[PDB]
Structures are given as structure tokens and as C-alpha cells.
Amino acid sequence: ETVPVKLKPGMDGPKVKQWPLTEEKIKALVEICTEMEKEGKISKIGPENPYNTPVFAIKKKDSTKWRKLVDFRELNKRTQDFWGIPHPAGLKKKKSVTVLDVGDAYFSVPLDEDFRKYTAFTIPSINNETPGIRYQYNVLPQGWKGSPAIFQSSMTKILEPFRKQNPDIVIYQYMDDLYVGSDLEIGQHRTKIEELRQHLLRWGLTYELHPDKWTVQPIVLPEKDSWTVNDIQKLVGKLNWASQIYPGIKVRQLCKLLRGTKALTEVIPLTEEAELELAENREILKEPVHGVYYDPSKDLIAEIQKQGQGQWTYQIYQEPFKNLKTGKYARMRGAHTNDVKQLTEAVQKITTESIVIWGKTPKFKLPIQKETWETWWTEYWQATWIPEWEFVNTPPLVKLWYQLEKEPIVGAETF
């Protein structure tokens, strides 16, 4: 049957325009949609339905098979609330988590007839020689928040038998995904996961994270045989900025070493007073600032800075200077000449951690121009959900500070 979904009081459906698509993509969406249309999941619609939601095609790893991805961000936001499952704090303390796309299960359930208009979408045509092909959903759409919700009774129902057979494994559902964490060893783990898929397949359904490894990393300050006017000037500027975080960070003694119009390359002898100050700073930076807790009723935020040479830094927080987590991302093999790829990959990684830790995606602040992002991010997108984002200008010092983060002695040695 169909449960009466609705929009939040005063809201109207999305009327987001279709961004242009490549011919490869339009051809696949066309294939995919005639099929969905034949199977009864979507129906062509008229011009009386003024709504719209962007669509695109992504690649299902290992296959040539193109997957359809609708961007329901606007509909989701306008969709009434249903007050999902409470986040399992245990999930982060698990040796290895795996992700599975259970979005395919929704086509089975029908969509409230009165809500369908709101799911309208369009397939463009090259050079616009053909009018777009409009359809709306007759079933639960993938990527819509209302789906996992409405399909919850059925999801837990099919899940129990496995959960009891393996009570040491955690299963969490966000959107179309299922993250399964267990403390079992790689093989016993994955074999146990595939055990889950076989289970999941006898109804209709078909990433390897390691959360316990996510180390909180500190800021390590430079140490030197001799310090130059410049070195000190560089150090003083970072420390001064950093005092917005740890107010006990001081640069007065150091600043006195900068009294004088001397050559930038000139070496300055550090006064013991200046040396204690620095040592007291290292001690302060030795640990995360106090009293930072996650407030569930507040937007989570993720800022990123391009560090150069394939390196990237980010910090997830809710309040300025009160970080919940910080980190670095080094490009993945192959991404050598493409920043947008490194960026989308970073956003996906960061977003899954967020899901894994707090069970919600953050709102990003991306160091990219709007048009560069909008034109190419889909090319490298691989997750079923899509986070929110805003485009920003990276303050020179925020980057300078986080580049100071501690890296391994040698590295996580994979013998």
C-alpha cells in the first residue's frame, strides 16, 4: 500500500533545472528509463507538472553498466520529517566497515500517488533538437530521504536473522547504503559480509573502511639548528593565528627577537625565555582543545584547503575553531593531473567518515570556483547521496596552520 507523504508546511516541490549532459550519459539514461518505464516504476508526464529534479549517470564500479543518479537534495529538504535509525556509536570503534548499495530495494514499494509529481525529472537532448523526456516516479525513488524511512519496517524485518546470527557485527543504513562493521579479520569479515549479500539477494539486492585507525593528529611545530628572521616571522604568524584556538599560545618573547630591521636570512640566537615560550606552545598543541562536543541539533561543516602536490587538508566542525576532527587527503593513484577528481574523491571520503561517525553528511566549503565544480564533479562522483556545498576562498593562514599537521615516522607500514 501507499503511505501519505507530504511536503513541509508552506513548501512547494523542486523546480531545479537539468544541467547539460554528455551524449554517453543521455544515451544510458534513455536506455535506463525506457526500462524503468516498461517495468512500471516511472511514467512519462505532461507540461502541467511544473516541477523538476536534476538527473545524471554515474559508474557502477567494475562494470560498463551506467547507474542513474537523481539529485533529490531539494526535494529531500522540502520533504516532511518522519519523527531513520539512531546512530550506533559502536560503528566508529570497528576494525573494518563495508558499504553496500541497497537502493535497488525501493522499486518494490509504491509511491503515494499525490507525491509523485514532486519527483518529476528530465532527460535532455543534444543541441536541444528534441524536447526533454519527462517522467515522474511511481515507486520509491533512490536518493530520496523518504525511501529508507518508508522502507524501514521491511528493512529491519529482512535484517534481524543475520544480526542475531552475528551479534558482533553492526549494520547501519544511510540513504541507499548499508555500512557493516565487524571486528573480524579481513577474510572472516568479508566472507561474513558476502554471507549478508546472499541473504540480501534472496529478496532483491546486490568500500572497505577501517574506522579504528582514524587517528586524531596534532600540529607539530618546526625545530631548527639556527632560526632566521624569516623562520621566526613565519612561526610567529602561525602561532598568532592559532591563538584563536588555544589562547595560551604566546608569541611575545619570540616577537622581541623580531625587534630590528635585519636581513631576512640573518640568524637570531633564541633567548631562553623565547625557548620556554615555544616549548610551552608545543605542550599546548600536544592535544585537541577542550570542551568540544558534537551537537546533533546543529549543522556539521567540512572545510577543505588545497595544500598542493596532490595534498589536501580538512576540518569538520560546527563552531569556528572547535574541531570535531581534522585530517589530510593525499590523491589516489591515477588522479595526478586532475584537481576536481581529487576534490570529489576527498568530499566522498570525508562524507563517508561523517556518516560513519555522526550519521549525517556535512555541508562543505570547497576551495573551487562554482563553475569548475558544477561542470565536472559528476564525472567522478561514486556515492548514491550528494552532500551540500558552498564555494569559498581559502584564507592563507588556515592552510599554513594545518599543513603543520603531524605525519608518520615512516608511514602505516603495509609490509
Return the number of the residue (43 or 165) whose C-beta is nearest another protein.
43
Whole-number Å distance between alpha carbons of 82 and 391: 31
Whole-number Å distance between alpha carbons of 115 and 112: 5
Of the candidates 212, 158, 154, the residue with the CA atom closest to the CA atom of residue 181: 212
The residue length of the chain stands at 415
Return the number of the residue (152 or 233) whose C-beta is nearest another protein.
233
Whole-number Å distance between alpha carbons of 222 and 237: 13
Spell out, one character per residue from 217 to 236, where the chain touches another protein: x when CB under 8 A holds, - when not: -----------xxx--xx-x
Please tell me whether residue 345 adopts helix, strand or coil conformation: helix
Count of other CB atoms within 10 angstroms of residue 140: 25
Q: Are 294 and 318 in contact (CB under 8 A)?
A: yes
Among positions 127, 198, 297, 414, the unique one binding another protein when judged by CB under 8 A = 127
128 binds another protein (CB under 8 A): yes
Annotated binding-site residue? 295:
no
DSSP annotation of 107: G
Return the number of the residue (294 or 373) whose C-beta is nearest another protein.
373
Provide, rounded to whole angstroms, the least separation between the CB of residue 217 and another protein. Answer: 22
Whole-number Å distance between alpha carbons of 183 and 210: 10
Stretch that binds another protein, among 101-109, 214-222, 356-364, 396-404 (CB under 8 A): 396-404
Return the number of the residue (29 or 386) whose C-beta is nearest another protein.
29
Count of other CB atoms within 10 angstroms of residue 126: 12
Provide, rounded to whole angstroms, the least separation between the CB of residue 337 and another protein. Answer: 8
Whole-number Å distance between alpha carbons of 346 and 366: 10
Return the number of the residue (67 or 306) whose C-beta is nearest another protein.
306
Annotated binding-site residue? 176:
yes
- For β-strands 363-366 and 388-391, DSSP reports them as parallel
Question: What is the footprint of another protein within residues 63-122 (CB under 8 A)?
Answer: 120
294 binds another protein (CB under 8 A): no
Return the number of the residue (10 or 248) whose C-beta is nearest another protein.
10
Return the number of the residue (266 or 299) whose C-beta is nearest another protein.
266
Residue 405 class from Cβ within 10 Å (0-12 exposed, 13-18 middle, 19+ buried)? Answer: middle
Return the number of the residue (49 or 108) whose C-beta is nearest another protein.
49
Stretch that binds another protein, among 56-64, 151-159, 259-267, 352-360 (CB under 8 A): 259-267
Of the candidates 237, 402, 242, the residue with the CA atom closest to the CA atom of residue 306: 402
Please tell me whether residue 11 adopts helix, strand or coil conformation: coil
Stretch that binds another protein, among 15-23, 67-75, 135-143, 326-334 (CB under 8 A): 15-23
Size of the residue set binding another protein (CB under 8 A): 59
Spell out, one character per residue from 19 to 58, where the chain touches another protein: x when CB under 8 A holds, - when not: -xxxxx-x-------------------xxxxxxx------
Question: What is the footprint of another protein within residues 326-385 (CB under 8 A)?
Answer: 338-340, 342-343, 366-369, 371-373, 375-376
Q: Are 304 and 346 in contact (CB under 8 A)?
A: yes
Q: Give the helix/strand (H/E) hosting 101.
A: strand 96-101
> What is the DSSP track for 41-100?
SEEE--TT---BB-EEEEE-TTSS-EEEEE-THHHHHHBPP-------GGGGG-SEEEEE
Among positions 263, 409, 410, 412, the unique one binding another protein when judged by CB under 8 A = 263
Provide, rounded to whole angstroms, the least separation between the CB of residue 215 and another protein. Answer: 26
Annotated binding-site residue? 112:
no
Q: Is 144 left (phi over 0), alpha (psi -120 to 50) or beta?
A: beta
Residues of the binding site:
101, 176-177
Which residues of this protein are in contact with another protein, per CB under 8 A? 17, 20-24, 26, 46-52, 120, 126-129, 131, 134, 228-230, 233-234, 236-237, 240, 251, 258, 261-266, 305-306, 308-309, 338-340, 342-343, 366-369, 371-373, 375-376, 394, 396-397, 399
Residues of the binding site for Mg(2+):
101, 176-177
